[PDB]
Structures are given as structure tokens and as C-alpha cells.
Amino acid sequence: DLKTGGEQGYLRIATEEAFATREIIDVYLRMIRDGTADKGMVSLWGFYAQSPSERATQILERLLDLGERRIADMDATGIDKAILALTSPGVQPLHDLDEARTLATRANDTLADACQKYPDRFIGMGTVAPQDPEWSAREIHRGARELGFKGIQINSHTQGRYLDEEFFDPIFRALVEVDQPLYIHPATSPDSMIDPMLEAGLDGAIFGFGVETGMHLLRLITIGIFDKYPSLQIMVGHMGEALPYWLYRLDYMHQAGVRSQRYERMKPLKKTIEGYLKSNVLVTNSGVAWEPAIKFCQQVMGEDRVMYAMDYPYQYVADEVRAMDAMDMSAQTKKKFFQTNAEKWFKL
Amino acid sequence: QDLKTGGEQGYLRIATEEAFATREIIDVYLRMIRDGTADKGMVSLWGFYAQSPSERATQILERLLDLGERRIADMDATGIDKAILALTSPGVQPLHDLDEARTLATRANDTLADACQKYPDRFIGMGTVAPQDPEWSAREIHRGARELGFKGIQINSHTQGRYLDEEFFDPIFRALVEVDQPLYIHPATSPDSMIDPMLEAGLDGAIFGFGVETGMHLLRLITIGIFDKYPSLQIMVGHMGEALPYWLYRLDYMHQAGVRSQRYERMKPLKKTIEGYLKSNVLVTNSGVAWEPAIKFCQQVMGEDRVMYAMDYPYQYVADEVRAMDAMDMSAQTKKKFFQTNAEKWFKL
Ligand SMILES: [Mn+2]
Numbered sequence: 229d230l231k232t233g234g235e236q237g238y239l240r241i242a243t244e245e246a247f248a249t250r251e252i253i254d255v256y257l258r259m260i261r262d263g264t265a266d267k268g269m270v271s272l273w274g275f276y277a278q279s280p281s282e283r284a285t286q287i288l289e290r291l292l293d294l295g296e297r298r299i300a301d302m303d304a305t306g307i308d309k310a311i312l313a314l315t316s317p318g319v320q321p322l323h324d325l326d327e328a329r330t331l332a333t334r335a336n337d338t339l340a341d342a343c344q345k346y347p348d349r350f351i352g353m354g355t356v357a358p359q360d361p362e363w364s365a366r367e368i369h370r371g372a373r374e375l376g377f378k379g380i381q382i383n384s385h386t387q388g389r390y391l392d393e394e395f396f397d398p399i400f401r402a403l404v405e406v407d408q409p410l411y412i413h414p415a416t417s418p419d420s421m422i423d424p425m426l427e428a429g430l431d432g433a434i435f436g437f438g439v440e441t442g443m444h445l446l447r448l449i450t451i452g453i454f455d456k457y458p459s460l461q462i463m464v465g466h467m468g469e470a471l472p473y474w475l476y477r478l479d480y481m482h483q484a485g486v487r488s489q490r491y492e493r494m495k496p497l498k499k500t501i502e503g504y505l506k507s508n509v510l511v512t513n514s515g516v517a518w519e520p521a522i523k524f525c526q527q528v529m530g531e532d533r534v535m536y537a538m539d540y541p542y543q544y545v546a547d548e549v550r551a552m553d554a555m556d557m558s559a560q561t562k563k564k565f566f567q568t569n570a571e572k573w574f575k576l
Numbered sequence: 577q578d579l580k581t582g583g584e585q586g587y588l589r590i591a592t593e594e595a596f597a598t599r600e601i602i603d604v605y606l607r608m609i610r611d612g613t614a615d616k617g618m619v620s621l622w623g624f625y626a627q628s629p630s631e632r633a634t635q636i637l638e639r640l641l642d643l644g645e646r647r648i649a650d651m652d653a654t655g656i657d658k659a660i661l662a663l664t665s666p667g668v669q670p671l672h673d674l675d676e677a678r679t680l681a682t683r684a685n686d687t688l689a690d691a692c693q694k695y696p697d698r699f700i701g702m703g704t705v706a707p708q709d710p711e712w713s714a715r716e717i718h719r720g721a722r723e724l725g726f727k728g729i730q731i732n733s734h735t736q737g738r739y740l741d742e743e744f745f746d747p748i749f750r751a752l753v754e755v756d757q758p759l760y761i762h763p764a765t766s767p768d769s770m771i772d773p774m775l776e777a778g779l780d781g782a783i784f785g786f787g788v789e790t791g792m793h794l795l796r797l798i799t800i801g802i803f804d805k806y807p808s809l810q811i812m813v814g815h816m817g818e819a820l821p822y823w824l825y826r827l828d829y830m831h832q833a834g835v836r837s838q839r840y841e842r843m844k845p846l847k848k849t850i851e852g853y854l855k856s857n858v859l860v861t862n863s864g865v866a867w868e869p870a871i872k873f874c875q876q877v878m879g880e881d882r883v884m885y886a887m888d889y890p891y892q893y894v895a896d897e898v899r900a901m902d903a904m905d906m907s908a909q910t911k912k913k914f915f916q917t918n919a920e921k922w923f924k925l
């Protein structure tokens with residue numbers, strides 16, 4: 229009952245879909261073995277790459293496939309197109325810059341090859357190495373102009389550092405030059421923040437992912453990234469990492485902080501936080517196949533700014549697709565949500 | 577829109593997360609800041625509120641300190657009939673000298689009891705405790721229920737980086753169930769172990785860090801099985817549930833995924849889903865969130881009987897917020913629950 233081809237009145241374009249390369253997963257394993265992995269890596273990838281559980285082993289196998297098996301899984305859930313990115317944390321944790329750039333290059337060329345082979349099914353977002361912002365800028369050039377990619381995905385922090393630092397500016401300069409979106413995907417929190425979450429089993433997707441990612445998007449908003457770069461669009465998954473829900477409180481407390489001069493890095497902005505959510509931020513529902521949360525986001529940010537995502541293979545659930553197809557929404561809204569918003573914002 | 581006391585609009589306005597301070601305890605914070613024993617959160621939060629020359633800070637400190645006619649006037653001016661009062665975060669929880677903590681918490685509780693006696697139709701008390709000493713805290717829970725007329729207690733999230741899911745804190749929960757009173761988990765700044773990236777961006781306080789710390793704490797309690805151990809226990813949180821109601825689908829999906837894959841020895845099977853515990857054991861206020869779409873979303877998730885009005889005076893003392901809440905496109909029956917009768921039930925007023 230879930231079919232490709234758009235007969236139900238829209239294509240299903242899934243906008244937060246993951247893959248891995250074996251050589252990068254082997255680096256994570258090396259890091260865990262040699263003690264250079266951070267606590268988040270040990271937690272996340274010591275689980276996914278090593279647990280014998282059904283969940284981990286299926287995720288690992290699915291991540292590594294970029295062909296007929298992934299296509300079969302998409303066919304079986306009626307997914308027309310998938311926007312693919314290297315799974316978190318990509319090469320961001322790597323201490324050897326030459327190794328990070330090499331592996332990122334390879335992962336990008338691997339993705340490009342797959343998209344060339346399945347051009348009606350797979351759409352690519354590039355991976356970068358923000359450890360090297362200037363290289364990353366050139367890799368943004370290459371993905372947009374040579375590889376056919378539609379943007380980049382950054383897996384939140386790089387070695388405990390956030391994108392609001394001036395150090396990272398070449399990434400933003402390059403994105404606005406090629407006029408492509410940035411997708412800030414979660415990662416585990418850095419060692420400076422993870423301990424109370426990790427000790428309770430909360431460091432991953434259940435909680436810590438949202439803390440890390442929402443903090444990252446928020447600190448970019450509050451540093452004025454969209455005043456510096458008014459064309460820039462930043463996408464986040466998981467229903468906006470709670471930011472839409474907190475909006476009233478964000479704006480109230482932002483304004484209080486600005487006016488009171490409480491903080492060096494919180495100065496006046498040209499728009500409210502609400503205003504940036506309406507003009508510069510875009511949200512997917514990855515992991516949140518939940519009609520009230522989706523409708524809430526659509527109401528707060530505008531229906532044109534909210535997109536369907538599956539989060540394959542971390543959350544591959546046919547009944548979720550069925551629930552999304554069944555939502556109490558107009559045909560027109562549902563087509564935006566499943567298809568045409570993604571067509572617009574990713575320039576498909 | 578006139579804001580009047582007396583319920584002529586169809587309900588009393590019962591404000592359920594309202595703060596006060598004591599000069600002696602603020603002086604301790606200043607001492608800890610000066611001597612270097614204050615954590616980064618204390619330096620940030622109380623360095624600001626107790627020392628900032630900012631207009632917001634100065635007026636907030638004066639209002640915090642008043643437990644009399646000024647506070648009453650401020651309530652009258654915004655049509656607030658009753659305020660549920662608690663010692664402002666982080667209370668005595670950061671203190672290293674337990675004699676001092678116990679003495680100052682006793683004093684603060686005595687002061688609050690005295691004020692509530694003076695204005696018994698306007699002020700309702702929640703006790704403060706010192707979780708560093710869970711035995712003393714248990715006695716203080718009983719003292720507040722027996723002698724002081726209090727309706728429960730407020731704990732200001734973590735105590736020196738230690739969380740209530742730890743077995744050490746069990747005597748506090750045992751005492752709450754014995755007196756049959758709720759726990760309000762109010763925010764605090766994050767501990768030094770988690771605060772640094774937030775603090776650097778100006779995000780450690782009410783804008784963001786408070787919700788992270790508090791949502792985390794409540795999620796840790798849910799997932800340790802506090803409500804299987806204590807099925808009668810009610811835990812209240814402000815700020816529209818510290819995002820948990822909005823995350824709920826993701827919370828349950830990933831909690832179940834973790835348990836079934838045996839990922840964390842800490843995370844064991846629970847008798848209810850997280851959704852089940854929200855509907856049976858957690859209560860939410862809208863402190864700081866005078867925003868209809870979020871209130872209505874939370875009502876749908878939790879049930880309209882489980883969501884209450886709060887002002888968060890004096891940190892967020894805004895007449896126009898009251899006006900907006902009075903004017904929500906919501907039935908008279910639901911509005912009366914939200915402002916009045918839910919609080920009357922859950923606080924046993
Ligand atoms: Mn994902």
C-alpha cells in the first residue's frame with residue numbers, strides 16, 4: 229500500500245537520509261580503540277558499529293548501502309527521492325587534517341557516484357571538515373559546481389567548537405556564493421557538556437541531540453548570522469530541535485538579555501527570533517511522525533517552511549509514512565510538506 | 577482590558593510559579609562569588625541579578641525581597657488573586673556549609689510561613705530544602721506540611737551537579753508521598769560539568785539553559801522509574817513543560833529503541849510510556865510562555881486538567897501577558913481550569 233510515483237497526489241521526498249562509508253566507520257573504531265574518541269563517539273559509535281542488537285546491526289548494514297538494497301527499502305515505503313548525507317559526526321572529530329580532507333573527499337565522490345547512478349532517486353548534500361574552513365569552502369564549490377550536490381550537512385560541533393566563531397566564516401561565505409542551504413544535523417555533545425546526559429543514557433537522539441543542535445542553531449541566530457548573511461537558509465530536523473515550541477520564551481529572554489547588556493555575544497539583531505524562523509530557518513520532521521507537532525510548526529513558521537524527512541535508516545517505519553499520508557491537512561498543504569517545499573529549498 | 581482581582585471574569589487568577597528572595601541568602605551568593613566558591617552558573621545568574629545596574633535587574637531584586645504590601649499591590653495591578661511562592665533559584669542548594677544551608681532554609685521557610693499567615697487569601701507557600709542533606713529535607717517537608725501551611729516544595733533542579741534520580745535523594749520522595757504533596761522542579765543554571773558552551777553564547781539562563789537543565793532532570797526521573805516506585809507522586813514543571821511535551825513522540829520512540837537494543841544498563845523497562853507518565857504524574861505551568869499555540873498544544877498532549885497558569889513574577893511581570901491569557905480563544909470552562917481550578921486541585925488549596 230505504499231507506492232512510488234505520486235499517485236496519491238505528491239511525491240514523497242525524504243530530506244534527512246543517512247549513509248556511511250566503511251573506511252570512516254573504521255576510523256571511529258580506531259579512535260575508540262586508541263583513546264582519542266570523545267565520550268560521544270564512544271557512546272554513539274561504540275553502540276552502532278559494535279552492538280549485536282537487531283537495531284544497531286540493521287542500521288549499520290542499511291547505512292553502508294548506496295544501491296539496490298536502499299532502493300528496495302525506499303520502494304517498499306513509497307519514498308520517491310532521498311536527500312543523502314554522510315552520517316554524523318562525519319569527519320568532524322578527526323584530529324589529522326590530511327586524513328579528514330581525504331576521507332571527506334572520498335565520501336563526497338562516493339555519494340556523487342551513487343547519485344549519478346540513481347539520478348531520479350538519490351540527491352546529495354556534501355560533507356565537509358570545518359577543522360579546515362578554507363578547504364571546506366573549496367569543497368562547497370566542488371559539490372555545488374562539479375558533483376551536483378544541493379548543499380552541505382554539518383554535524384553540529386567540530387571538536388567542541390561552534391559555527392558562530394569567526395574562524396568558520398569561510399563556510400558561510402562559500403554557501404552564500406553558491407547560494408545553497410546548510411543542514412545542521414545533530415551530533416553527540418562535546419566532552420564539555422555531555423556528562424550529565426551520558427550518565428543517564430540521554431546523550432543521543434532521545435535528548436542530547438536536540439540540546440546540542442538547538443543550541444547550535446540558536447547561537448548562530450543570536451550572533452547575527454542572518455544579518456551578516458540575509459540570503460542564508462539553515463535547515464534543521466527533528467521538528468526544529470524544540471526551538472519553535474520555545475519561540476515565545478526565546479524572544480522574550482533574548483530581548484531582555486539584549487536590552488540589559490548582559491552578554492558580550494548577545495547584541496541587537498535586525499529581526500526577532502520569530503522573524504528569522506520565518507525567513508531564514510527551515511525545518512524537517514525527521515523522527516517526529518506526529519501530526520500535532522508538525523501542524524504546530526507549520527502554524528508558527530509557515531507551511532512553506534516545514535518538510536517531510538524519514539531519518540532513514542535510524543527510523544525506518546512504514547507505519548510512520550502511512551500516518552503522514554493520513555494527516556488532516558489539505559491536499560495542497562500535504563503536497564508542500566512531502567514534495568514542493570523540498571523542491572524549492574533544495575533547488576531540485 | 578481591565579485586570580481586576582475578585583474573579584468577576586469567571587475565575588480567580590492563581591499564579592503558580594512566583595518567586596521571592598531573602599537578603600541573607602543573596603548575601604551568601606555574593607560571598608561565594610567574591611571568594612571563588614560560586615559555580616559558573618551562580619556567577620552568571622546572581623552576578624547579574626544582585627549586581628547588575630540594569631533596570632530589569634534592580635527592580636527584580638527589590639520585588640523579590642518584598643513579601644508584603646508592594647507585592648500585593650503588584651498582584652492587584654495585574655488581577656492576580658493568589659500567588660504560589662517559593663524561594664528563588666538556586667535556593668540553598670549550592671551551599672557548601674550544610675549548617676549554613678539548613679539554618680538559612682529554616683529561616684526562609686519561617687519567613688514565608690509568616691508572610692502567608694499575614695495574607696492568607698493571597699499568598700500560598702512552597703517550602704525550600706537542602707538536598708545535600710536528604711534526611712533534614714524530609715523533616716522539613718514534614719514541618720512545612722504540619723506546621724507551616726505549605727502545599728509542597730520547590731527544588732531548584734540539580735544540587736551541586738547531583739540529580740534527584742540518584743538513590744541518595746530517596747528520603748525526599750518518601751517524605752513527599754507521606755505528606756501527599758507535589759514537587760515543583762524549578763530551573764537552575766546548569767552545573768559546571770555542562771554549562772560552558774551555553775555560558776559562552778549567553779544561553780545559560782532562562783533563554784535556553786534553564787530548559788535544558790530542567791527538562792533533562794525531569795526526563796532522568798521519568799526514565800529511572802520514579803513513578804513506578806512512587807505512583808502517587810506528582811511532579812510540576814514550568815515553562816510549558818521544559819519542551820518535553822513537544823518532544824514527546826521522539827522521547828518515546830528513542831526511549832523504547834534504547835531499551836529494546838539494550839544500549840544503556842541504566843535504562844530499564846518502565847511500566848508506562850513517557851506519554852503515560854505525563855498524563856498521570858507530571859503537571860505543567862505556562863510560566864514565561866504567555867503564548868496560546870504552545871498552551872493549547874500542551875493541553876492536547878497532557879490534558880486540559882494538567883496545565884496551569886503561572887506568571888513567573890517578578891522575572892516576567894507583564895500586564896499585557898495577563899490580558900492575552902484572559903483573552904484566549906478557549907472555552908470559559910477550560911479557561912477557568914487553566915487559571916484556577918487545576919491549581920486548586922493539584923495544590924490542595
Ligand atoms: Mn538524521
Ligand SMILES: [Mn+2]
Binds near residue numbers: 593594595814888
Ligand atoms: Mn520561575
